[PDB]
Design a protein around this ligand. Structure first.
Ligand SMILES: Cc1ccncc1NC(=O)[C@@H](c1cccc(Cl)c1)C(C)C
Ligand SMILES: Cc1ccncc1NC(=O)[C@@H](c1cccc(Cl)c1)C(C)C
Lengths: 304, 304
């Protein structure tokens, strides 16, 4: 009973958080095996951020300039390299708390948990989605850079995001663990605007299935629709177009509830055209799009 | 930038989760030092739950009937006792992962993180509030009993909740770690109805302060009000009455934003009387009441 915006347990990732200082700048690092991953803008001063030349700035840095601290103990840095927008600091000690892990580059619409950190210490955990415009709507302050996004399957942590920046509109941009930004963002203090933040249609449908499973059924109607008819409505409301791939992924939820995917699409269509009329769905007065079909199944079945 | 429903990092609590089996029933236990805490209904069969006599049922149980498993290793049970609605199983090994901890009984309106578990294994973490009717709106399935609610200050985990049951309306009831239920609930499979779920006014005001801090200011108006005038409106909308104690607790947020508490009360009054008019506040189309004034300060300052 009940449906909550649930994050993965953060323990396995807390044991990886370290603090990295280079000169006057301090941010977070992810320590996996004998490597510490961090945003390359740790080498920049506030003035450098306006138009940094990272290759040139990195020439003035040696292994001893990167101060890595895990808890209250200092790690010895024996190598350093730049991979896209991240620095990989080879230390002399493998992290004894390294969980089973993978580096994954997620697609927009996918969700993940963020362990927000400051000075290598965890402050909190929350659930995010990679928006269709490749930004994330997080909660990050100065010092939170190097905080990571991740998913967990059984005992394996799939790291997918590393926080780098905030756009002037209060949204967040970052990279995967190979240092490649999601979207067209650059690690420079320059005005970078986000594109249209469209709604993740398949996630909304998944959340409507979660609602039916938990007893909120008022929005179920007598109508059905087609993929093409639904998508005409989706385009109008800035919703992502729904494909047969999205329909396939909703299969298990459709099977459990007995409500055909296209019937749920017709309920969503009426919700878009008429609104909620002052009503709520799973304690929300808007259509929630940051639960994937996999998140709904996991939460509704008790996957540990 | 940004404001999220953030949970505390769960690692310190993950290291405490164990599985407890008694006969055919399996639920979660909290292992702190050499004691495992769990709901006393672990001794019940499905038939027992209708009208259990826990003292009588416990007579037929010995130390060897409580199977405690931490990960994949079995703990030896050397003592057992019932304290209110929890069982305290003395084991022969102190939990090496026991964090600094306290047992606190929270007041309604206070928030906490829940580490939902099944079979001693963590499934996810989310943020809850103790409702004014002493229920919590969680996400729990069969097997989640024994999952705990907690807050963290620096390195000390304050455990405040242990999950016991779901009411027929899909809301949740449980105890503090001394086994005392929050509210009037009993650990019996009997129809127990919740009272009015009133809105936590001080939390809504705290969240409006968080919104102003993050740039959502459209709801700020030219009005002010008094505690008595505001409370006439609060009574009408099933909001908790606001006291000078609530005003005092909002002091630091009032000081940071420069918006007097009674002015923010007048904005909230207009929001209650006029609605949102299709607009959003911090990505929400309703007035969020599960952030305390302390949660807003912590998130807005970066407390680790
Ligand atoms: C202040 C903040 C709040 C939340 N998240 C991150 C930051 N940090 C920055 O946005 C930094 C930044 C700007 C532009 C590009 C890059 Cl790579 C980094 C810096 C301007 C302080
Ligand atoms: C099924 C579920 C889902 C979510 N949270 C808890 C449960 N568990 C119960 O509600 C149990 C229960 C009922 C009445 C009293 C007590 Cl102490 C325990 C039992 C009826 C299965």
């Amino acid at each position: 009973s009940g449906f909550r915006k649930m994050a993965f347990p953060s323990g396995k990732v807390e044991g990886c958080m370290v603090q990295v200082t280079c000169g006057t700048t301090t941010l977070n690092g992810l320590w996996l095996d004998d490597v510490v991953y961090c945003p390359r803008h740790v080498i920049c001063t506030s003035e450098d951020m306006l138009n940094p030349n990272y290759e040139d700035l990195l020439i003035r840095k040696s292994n001893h300039n990167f101060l890595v601290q895990a808890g209250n103990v200092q790690l010895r840095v024996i190598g350093h390299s730049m991979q896209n927008c991240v620095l990989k600091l080879k230390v002399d000690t493998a992290n004894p708390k390294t969980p089973k892990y993978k580096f994954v580059r997620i697609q927009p619409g996918q969700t993940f948990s963020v362990l927000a950190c400051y000075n290598g210490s965890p402050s909190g955990v929350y659930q995010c989605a990679m928006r269709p415009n490749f930004t994330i709507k997080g909660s990050f302050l100065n010092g939170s850079c190097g905080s990571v996004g991740f998913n967990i399957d059984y005992d394996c942590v799939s790291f997918c995001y590393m926080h780098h920046m905030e756009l002037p509109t209060g949204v967040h941009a970052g990279t995967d663990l190979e240092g490649n930004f999601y979207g067209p963002f650059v690690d420079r203090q320059t005005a970078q605007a986000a594109g249209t933040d469209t709604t993740i249609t398949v996630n909304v449908l998944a959340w409507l299935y979660a609602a039916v499973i938990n007893g909120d059924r008022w929005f179920l109607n007598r109508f059905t629709t087609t993929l093409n008819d639904f998508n005409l409505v989706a385009m109008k409301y800035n919703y992502e177009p729904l494909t047969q791939d999205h329909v396939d992924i909703l299969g298990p939820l459709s099977a459990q509830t007995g409500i055909a995917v296209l019937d749920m699409c017709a309920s969503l269509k009426e919700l878009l055209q008429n609104g909620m009329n002052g009503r709520t769905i799973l304690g929300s007065a808007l259509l929630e799009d940051e639960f994937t079909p996999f998140d709904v199944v996991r939460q509704c079945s008790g996957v540990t």
